[PDB]
């Protein structure tokens, strides 16, 4: 993978060393925010950010996540929302490999966390 340097550098910017070569799927565990995966699939890099919610937090999160990802309410990136099983809110964004840059990857990550934060406020 030619995009390894960008992913490696991103991880190093978070203070996470990685050994080369990197897997096509990198998983970063965040103490509160959940599980971040950086997945290379086809000519795409998708960031998936999954977080398990307590039952009494799930309904409002679903509605807000759908509401706040509408194009009219969105920013520069195509952040999307989904769900896994009983209780995991999943927020995600796909990036075209051919125009990926480190600043783009950083803002994809930051804008996913920001969204999650507004969704759970």
């Amino acid at each position: 993978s030619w995009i390894e340097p960008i992913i490696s550098h991103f991880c190093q910017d978070l203070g996470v060393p990685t050994s080369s070569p990197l897997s096509p799927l990198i998983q970063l565990e965040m103490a509160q925010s959940g599980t971040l995966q950086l997945e290379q699939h086809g000519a795409t890099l998708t960031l998936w950010l999954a977080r398990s919610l307590a039952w009494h937090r799930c309904e409002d999160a679903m509605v807000k996540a759908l509401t706040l990802t509408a194009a009219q309410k969105s920013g520069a990136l195509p952040l999307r929302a989904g769900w896994l099983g009983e209780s995991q809110l999943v927020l995600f964004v796909s990036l075209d490999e051919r125009s990926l840059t480190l600043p783009l990857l950083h803002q994809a990550f930051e804008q996913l966390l920001r969204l999650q934060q507004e969704v759970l406020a």
């Binding site: 699939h41 795409t44 998708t46 799930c58 309904e59 679903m62 509605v63 996540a65 759908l66 509401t67 990802t69 509408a70 194009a71 009219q72 969105s74 195509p78 999307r80 929302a81 989904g82 769900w83 896994l84 099983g85 999943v90 995600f92 796909s94 075209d96 125009s99």
Partner: protein
């Protein structure tokens, strides 16, 4: 719009007409596909009627969870986003970057839009 001119011509049709805000509206096998340029994106939108979405004020969580689970399941292969609009009604959207979009690509995303609608609509109706 060059792309919509190209698509109309490729289908053998007269050019499509936009409203005053530049939004196009096509009904394709009974499904409305709105195409709305904003800055550097073109956004496709199809509002969905989903009577079972809420009984009175009560949102059907089981259904919402199921639809969001599907949204994740299609994410790798379809660019569409399931969202709620300003009326709190479901809408299937796709945000396309004009920097990268050609007529082929527009047609493909339209094909994908209709494909997902045909999958979803039966779940939200009789």
């Amino acid at each position: 719009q060059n792309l919509l001119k190209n698509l109309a011509a490729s289908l053998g049709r007269k050019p499509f007409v936009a409203d005053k805000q530049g939004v196009y509206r096509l009904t394709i096998d009974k499904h409305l596909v709105m195409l709305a340029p904003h800055g550097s994106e073109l956004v496709l939108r199809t509002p969905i009627d989903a009577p079972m979405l809420r009984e009175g004020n009560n949102v059907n969580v089981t259904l919402l969870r199921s639809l969001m689970q599907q949204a994740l399941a299609w994410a790798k292969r379809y660019p569409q986003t399931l969202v709620l609009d300003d009326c709190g009604q479901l809408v299937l959207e796709a945000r396309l970057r004009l920097q990268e979009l050609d007529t082929h690509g527009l047609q493909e995303v339209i094909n994908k839009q209709l494909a997902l609608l045909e999958h979803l609509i039966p779940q939200l109706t009789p």
